[PDB]
């Protein structure tokens, strides 16, 4: 799995500004259909990840499945600062 | 299932601003572990949904699984206007 990307509010605005192509719209889903944690071994011992799954209707796309797969997408979580570890604090952009 | 939320760039930015109120950071993940289209059935026929699962490391949190479950989160997708259906175009804010 990928590293953690934690953003200050301003760096999160910058990140968006950088990633928003001129002619795009943003489809937003808060429809979480599953959420859980799983472990995986790495070359540096066992780790834990959260998995959050979101649903959203396909009827808004005139696009096939692999096209929607290819589209730039992100999950975002709003986390109060009291709820970070030391590691989560070290990571803040 | 919730209806689709589709925002123009400016509406999308206004929407997120409303969440950046407190001592809050934003955890962002593009680590899609699973992506597919699946049919959903009801009494009045079938509808296709996309499902997007994202992973993010747990060790950044000082929080159990139910607490991460409870935090505000969204999947967002960046879509070319020329890739929307007529209904998707319809629903822009």
Domains identified in chain B, total number: 1
What SS3 state is found at B35? strand
Closest CA to A2 of B35, B59, B72, B32: B32
Residues 6+ apart with CB under 8 A from A34: A51, A52, A53, B53
The alpha-carbon gap from A82 to the nearest alpha carbon of chain B, in Å, equals: 8
**φ/ψ bin of A3: left (φ > 0), alpha (ψ from -120 to 50), beta (otherwise):** beta
- Secondary structure class of A71 (helix, strand, coil): coil
d(CA A22, CA A25): 9
Residue A87: enclosing H or E segment and its boundaries?
helix A86-90
Question: What is the resolution of the experimental data for this entry, in Å?
Answer: 2.4
Are B79 and B85 in contact by the 8 Å Cβ rule? The answer is no
Is the CB of B65 less than 8 angstroms away from the CB of A25?
A: no
Contacts of A50 (CB under 8 A, 6+ apart): A35, A36, A37, B55, B56, B57, B58, B65, B68
Q: B37 to chain A: nearest residue by CA?
A: A65
The domain spanning residue A17 has which CATH number?
3.30.1970.10
Q: Where are the alpha helices (DSSP H) in B1-93?
A: 9-17, 65-70, 86-90
Residue closest to A58 by CA, chosen among B73, B47, B7, B80: B47
Q: Provide the terminal-to-terminal Cα distance of chain A, rounded to the nearest Å.
A: 20
Query: Residue B77's closest CA among B56, B54, B48, B57?
Result: B54
Q: Chain A: nearest CA to B70, how far in angstroms?
A: 10
CA B33 to chain centre: 15
Q: What is the domain extent for residue A20?
A: 1-93
Instruction: Please write down the long-range contacts of A71-74, taking CB distance under 8 Å and 24 or more positions apart.
Output: A71/B77, A71/B78, A71/B79, A71/B83, A72/A19, A72/B30, A72/B77, A72/B78, A73/B30, A73/B32, A73/B52, A73/B75, A73/B76, A73/B77, A73/B78, A74/B28, A74/B29, A74/B30, A74/B54, A74/B75, A74/B76
Q: Best interface-test mutation with A: which of B20, B33, B74, B87 has the largest number of A CBs within 10 A?
A: B74
A28 vs B80: CB contact, 8 Å cut-off?
Answer: no
Distance CA A32, CA A29 (A): 8
């Amino acid at each position: 799995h990928m590293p953690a990307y934690v953003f200050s509010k301003e760096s999160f605005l910058k990140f968006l500004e950088g990633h928003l192509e001129d002619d795009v719209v943003v489809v937003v889903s808060s429809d979480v259909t599953d959420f859980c944690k799983k472990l995986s071994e790495s070359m540096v011992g066992e780790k834990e990840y959260c998995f959050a799954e979101f649903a959203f209707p396909a009827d808004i796309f005139d696009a096939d499945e692999d096209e929607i797969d290819e589209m730039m997408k992100y999950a975002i979580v709003f986390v109060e600062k009291e709820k970070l570890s030391e590691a989560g604090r070290n990571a803040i952009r």
